[PDB]
Structure formats: structure tokens, C-alpha cells
């Protein structure tokens, strides 16, 4: 009956909790107590990109570490050349309510989506000389939160109907759907070798999914409300999350536990975005208090602040070679720090 | 720019033309009036959009129309079953809110209390501290027919007025206005929807004008 199944789930939860606790002899801090501190991180602003006329909601770096794309609520996608602050393309959208954007790893296509429950794929290289819509992918029943290219023919999306999906851009049909969350999925992150990915949702839990067969492998809890951002460590064996309780967290795949908590007593606002450095030593996080903090990821110390925006910082990214950091904000500006 | 090459100058000229087109498009799109349409399930939103769709030009639904050389756009988000707290901050900065309530629900499952809860949630929000609300009370005739048999006291235990339209409608209107807690900043406009054509859109037009004028006067006096 139902009651025996609830008791069975309680016994399985107790078994998981005891098996996790039985292999936690030492802390990450005790191990990294003898490391020298990083010191002080002082980053200046090198470029300022202007031309948006409303709030900026997403951005993504190109894989050549020079070009990038930005999305805003005035109904434009803009492609920027960060070295000279020139505009390469400007794409008008059919819907002004856009919440995410992505850049293909090859450079040929660009993806977009928002409150219209549709993911749009745009072709950047054509004989006619203008950017045109290549495909529209429909089938989600809630707003689209994030999207990431795996290839020129495969894309992974997450939505506020508590599901994720994997698409086939040639055909336009879902090949696999990932279910199990009980809240709106808000963020998503691909592994470096592109065989697994993580998803963070509004039930205050994160899940590890396997791309080849749509099954969940591990579930990580510990937050208190509404994980908003997630990212992989460069090694591919750990990840970090950021939520509304003004706290970042570091989770480890192989030990299936929690390693460190990045919280301060003077910070009481939520976190919008999170990212790592190139070597995985610094953790950068954006907040609602118009700032951006830089944390020593191994000693859990505050190392720096980026304080050049006038409204909420909504998006944040680091280049592939690790030469610069880009931040976007609701005051309609993008800045490059180095 | 004296060290640039021949191709760099043409790239800069292309970027300047892109800037010009962006500025002209923003100047053109800054002359719109944006309204957010809300309600509690089946209230009569379809009737309002049908009887205001004077001209013609799931996800989200759009409607563009003109009335006395003034353009309006009305967004409807009744198909979003996800969490409202995660996408409502996209709609701050709209000109006004159109809230639709049906008067025939005072004895149905009441269902009026759900409308009261939604109005209290949206009127005292942290993003709509200054956005004006236009309130439509649809289904007047069916309320007239139903009140003659089912007394209003089934909805309000504290009611003590007469069982007739003129008193009960004013009592409902006051039990909906008396939920604002910022009577110094915003305002509530009430209109009992009538089947006669043009009247409803006229009321919207008058309200949006007298809201724009008070905004221009409130702000430009800052110094």
C-alpha cells in the first residue's frame, strides 16, 4: 500500500544519509589550511559596451574569446567584438520577452528563448548576407530558462514546467526528456567532455543527468531556497551553486557531499550568476546589491569586489583562455574586467 | 583613428549605421502604451479583448490597436502555470494594469475571495509601487438576475444593506478599493462594463491620458 512505500522511501533516505556521513572524516578547510592566501585581486574596467535600451538578461562568450552575444528586453540580440567595441550583427526578435541566449561552439548559429515557450535558432553565415531564423523548437509548456549547444545539431534546454529536454535541430523533435524535479528548473550546466550535465531548480536541489540515457544519477541538497545559478569546476568532478539565501555552495561528485559554503554576514541579497576562474581557484558571483564578489575557492575567503554597475547584475562570464570577465546588468551596460 | 587599415574603417562605418538604426528604432518604439491584463481564471478577459479588438494589425498573447491616433499593446499571461514570482519583474515599467473581476461569482466555489487575494497580491507588490490599476467589473446583468434570489450575505457575513443592485455593487467596489495601502502614490479606476460599444475603450483612453499627464508633471518637477 501507500504507507509501506512511504516507509520504504524513509528507510532509503536514512541509508543514503548514513552512507554519506560514514565517509566524511576530514573537512576541505583542514586539508587546505596550510595553503598561502591569494592576496588582493584588483581588476579595472577595460571596455564598456553600450547600445542596449532596456534590461540585459543574458550573455555568452564565443569560443574564440573575442566575440560575444547579448540579449535584452528591447527586442534585440547584439553580437559584439570586445577588442574594438564594434557591433557585428544586430538581430530583431519576434518576441520581446527573452530570458536566455547561447553561442554555438563552432560559431555558425545562435539560440534564443524566453516567455514564449519557444527556442529559436539563427543562422549567422549565409549567401544572402543577413541573419535569418533557421528553426523554432516548440513543445515546452512553461517559459524557457537556459539553453546550451552540444553540437551544430543538438541542444539542451530547461524550462519552468519542471523538465529538461534534448533536441534534434535537423528534425525539430525531442529525443530525450528529463523529468524528476518538483519545481521550476532555473539553471543548467554542461560537463567539459559533454556526457553529463547538472540542473538547478526551485525545489532547492540539484540533479546530475546522463545525456545518453535519460536517467538521474545523483541528487544534491543543502540549500534553503531557489537555486538560481550553477557551474562546473574545470576538472569536471565538482560544481558550485548559488541561490536566494545569499550563499554559494561547492558540491563534489565522487564523494556525493558538500565541501564548502561561501557566505558572509554582511550579504543578505540573492545571487544571480556564478562562474569559476580558468584554474578553478577563484569563484566569481553576482548579487542583487549591484556588486560582484571574488572568493578564494579553496579557503573560503573574500578576495575582491567589482563595483561598477548601478543596478542588479544579471549575467556574468569568463573567457576560455581566462583573460577577461564580462558582466551585464539591468542598467543596460556590459563591462569587461581584467 | 589614423592607424586603422582600409577594412577597419569600413567596419567602423558599419557599426555606426547599426547604431543609427538602433536609435531610430528605440525612438519609434518609445511612443507605445503598454498594458498588463490580469484576472482570476474565467472572469471575462476574453469578452474584454473581443469587445476592444476594434482593429486588427501557448505562451503569451499580444494585441495591438489604435484609438484616436494612440497606439496600445495589451499583454495577456493567463496561460503561464509556472511560478509568478519568477517572471513578474519583467513587467515593471508598464503604463497600467487592467484587472478583470466578474460580479456573478459572489456565491460560487467563495470564488470572489480568490479575486480579493489576487488583487491584494498584485496591488501591494514590490515592483508595482506606482503603477496604476484599471478595474473592470464584468457580468453586471447576470449579477442583477442572481441577486434577486441569492442574497449577498452568502459572501459577506458582515453585510447589512438592502438586497438591490445599486447598494450591493457600491459595497463590492468599496470592498475592492479598500485593499490599497498606498493611497498617496497610485490610484484605482473602476468601470462597470456595459455592452454598448466604444464606451470601454473610451474609459481606458481617458485613464491612460490622465495617468501620463500626472506622470510628466510629477517627474519633471524634481529639479
Amino acid at each position, epitope marked *: 500500500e501507500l504507507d509501506q512505500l512511504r516507509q520504504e522511501a524513509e528507510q532509503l533516505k536514512n541509508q543514503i544519509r548514513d552512507a554519506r556521513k560514514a565517509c566524511a572524516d576530514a573537512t576541505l578547510s583542514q586539508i587546505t589550511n596550510n595553503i598561502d592566501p591569494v592576496g588582493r585581486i584588483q581588476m579595472r574596467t577595460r571596455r564598456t559596451l553600450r547600445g542596449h535600451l532596456a534590461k540585459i538578461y543574458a550573455m555568452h562568450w564565443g569560443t574564440d574569446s*573575442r566575440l560575444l552575444v547579448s540579449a535584452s528586453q528591447d527586442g534585440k540580440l547584439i553580437i559584439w567584438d570586445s577588442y574594438t567595441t564594434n557591433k557585428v550583427h544586430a538581430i530583431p526578435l519576434r518576441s520581446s520577452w527573452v530570458m536566455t541566449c547561447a553561442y554555438a561552439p563552432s560559431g555558425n548559429y545562435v539560440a534564443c528563448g524566453g516567455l514564449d515557450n519557444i527556442c529559436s535558432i539563427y543562422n549567422l553565415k549565409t549567401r*544572402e548576407g543577413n541573419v535569418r531564423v533557421s528553426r523554432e523548437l516548440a513543445g515546452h509548456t512553461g517559459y524557457l530558462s537556459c539553453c546550451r549547444f552540444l553540437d551544430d545539431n543538438q541542444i539542451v534546454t530547461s524550462s519552468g514546467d519542471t523538465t529538461c529536454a534534448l533536441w534534434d535541430i535537423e528534425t525539430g523533435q525531442q529525443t530525450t526528456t528529463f523529468t524528476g524535479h518538483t519545481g521550476d528548473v532555473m539553471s543548467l550546466s554542461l560537463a567539459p567532455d559533454t556526457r553529463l550535465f547538472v540542473s538547478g531548480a526551485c525545489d532547492a536541489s540539484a540533479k546530475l543527468w546522463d545525456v545518453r540515457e535519460g536517467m538521474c544519477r545523483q541528487t544534491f541538497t543543502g540549500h534553503e531556497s531557489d537555486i538560481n545559478a550553477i557551474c562546473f569546476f574545470p576538472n569536471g568532478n565538482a560544481f558550485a551553486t548559488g541561490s536566494d539565501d545569499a550563499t554559494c555552495r561547492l558540491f563534489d561528485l565522487r564523494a556525493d557531499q558538500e565541501l564548502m559554503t561561501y557566505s558572509h554576514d554582511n550579504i543578505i541579497c540573492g545571487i544571480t550568476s556564478v562562474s569559476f576562474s580558468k584554474s578553478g581557484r577563484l569563484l566569481l558571483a553576482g548579487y542583487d546589491d549591484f556588486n560582484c564578489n571574488v572568493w578564494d575557492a579553496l579557503k573560503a575567503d573574500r578576495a575582491g569586489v567589482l563595483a561598477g554597475h548601478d543596478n542588479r547584475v544579471s549575467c556574468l562570464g569568463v573567457t576560455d583562455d581566462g583573460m577577461a570577465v564580462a558582466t551585464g546588468s539591468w542598467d543596460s551596460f556590459l563591462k569587461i574586467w581584467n | 583613428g589614423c592607424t586603422l587599415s*582600409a577594412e*577597419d574603417k*569600413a567596419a567602423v562605418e*558599419r557599426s555606426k549605421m547599426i547604431d543609427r538604426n538602433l536609435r531610430e528604432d528605440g525612438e519609434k518604439a518609445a511612443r507605445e502604451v503598454k498594458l498588463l491584463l490580469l484576472g482570476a481564471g474565467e472572469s471575462g478577459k476574453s469578452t474584454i479583448v473581443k469587445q476592444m479588438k476594434i482593429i486588427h494589425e501557448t505562451g503569451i498573447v499580444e494585441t495591438h490597436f489604435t484609438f484616436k491616433d494612440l497606439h496600445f499593446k495589451m499583454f495577456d499571461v493567463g496561460g503561464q502555470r509556472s511560478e509568478r514570482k519568477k517572471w513578474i519583474h519583467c513587467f515593471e515599467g508598464v503604463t497600467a494594469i487592467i484587472f478583470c473581476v466578474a460580479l456573478s461569482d459572489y456565491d460560487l466555489v467563495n470564488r470572489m475571495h480568490e479575486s480579493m487575494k489576487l488583487f491584494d497580491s498584485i496591488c501591494n507588490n514590490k515592483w508595482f509601487t506606482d503603477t496604476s490599476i484599471i478595474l473592470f467589473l464584468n457580468k453586471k446583468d447576470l449579477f442583477e438576475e442572481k441577486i434577486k434570489k441569492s442574497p449577498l450575505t452568502i459572501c459577506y457575513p458582515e453585510y447589512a444593506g438592502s438586497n438591490t443592485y445599486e447598494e450591493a455593487a457600491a459595497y463590492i467596489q468599496c470592498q475592492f478599493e479598500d485593499l490599497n495601502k498606498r493611497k498617496d502614490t497610485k490610484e484605482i479606476y473602476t468601470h462597470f462594463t456595459c455592452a454598448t460599444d466604444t464606451k470601454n475603450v473610451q474609459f481606458v483612453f481617458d485613464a491612460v491620458t490622465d495617468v501620463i499627464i500626472k506622470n510628466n508633471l510629477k517627474d519633471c518637477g524634481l529639479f
Partner: single-chain antibody
Amino acid sequence: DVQLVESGGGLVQPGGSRKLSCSASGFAFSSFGMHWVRQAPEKGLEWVAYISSGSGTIYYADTVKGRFTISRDDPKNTLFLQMTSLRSEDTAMYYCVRSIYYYGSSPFDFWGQGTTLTVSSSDIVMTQATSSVPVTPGESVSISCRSSKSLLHSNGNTYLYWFLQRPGQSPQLLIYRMSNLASGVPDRFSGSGSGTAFTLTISRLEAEDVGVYYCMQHLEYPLTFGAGTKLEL
């Protein structure tokens, strides 16, 4: 498909005037810059005139200043050249070329068809060895083109372009900026070289690769071509 068709050529009494037109169809005309390039009856190519996108920049060759005028009409998708005081040295064949400039683009990618005009009775120098070398199908060949002034800019780019003209046709882009392979070109063509010394390498030479090869520089106006080297069986 992409098309550029020219008209307005014929026999002209010297000292007269004429107008040439170039009608495009198949692409976004208003986003491209346009060039007029002419070819003498038995010699190589020479750049003539250039009009920008948005008509904000116009350049002319050193020999047609004060005589020729270039213009465009965007709604009808037309490019015009007005020619006055026609000297007998203007007898040539005129081509209409499109080019677009942004980070990563490929200028000079589509060439027109050509119209024939028969008038009755500080520059960078690019050098090539014009002797028609013999080839056989299967082997590999190299082509050289040395400049007088270094084509390497300070931003890392080297502005050299390679074109191929098969017998009785219009030129075709092969290599742009000394290394990049054009779209639709088989991977048998390679381009390399340092400043003031460049090489084009063809491996596994087929039977459709006979013709004339030209090298061009795009470092600064006026644009200058080479004399052109011929491959024949």
C-alpha cells in the same frame, strides 16, 4: 540565386559619354559595398571605382578622377556608372563586384558577368613571373607574388587576395587574407608566405584548373593587382 547583370555597353565616338548599369537580385543589396573593375582587351585587371554602403564613402582610381561618377539606387537595386569625355584608353570590359566588411567577412566574393565598352579611334607595386608554365594532371605547382611594401599590418592581418579566371569567364575568389580558404573552394589550394613574399600551392592538379591567376592587395587605396600568371596543359 545571387545574380549581378550589367548592361549599357557598345561603340562610342571618342569624347562622348555613356552610362553603365548593374542590376542585382538574390541578396540584401543595401548591406554591401560595390566596386567597378575593368579589364583591357588583352591585359590584366585594374580597379576603377568604389562606393560604400549607405553611400557615405566614394573612391576613384587615379586616371578617372573628374571624368567618372559612381552611384547606387537602393529601392530598385541598381548600381550606376556615368562616364564622360571618353578617351581611347577606356576600351575595356567592365565588371561589378560586391564586398562586405566586418570581423571575419570575405570581400570580393561574387563577381558580375561583364559588359564591353569600345571607344573608337606612392602606389604599391605587385610583381609576378608571367611566363605560362606547363602542367600535367596529377602533379603540384606553386605560384609566387612579391610586393614592394610590406602588407603586414600591426593588428596581425596580412592583406593578400588570390583570384582565378578560367578561359572565357569571370574571376573567382580562392584565398583571402593570405591563408583563409573561400566558401565552395576545394581544399587542394593552400596559401602561405611572409611579408613581401607569398606563395599559392596547388596539389593534385585537375583538368579544370587551367587559367590565369591574379594577386591583389587590400592594404590601402587604390587597390592594385598583379600581372597574372597562366597555367596551361
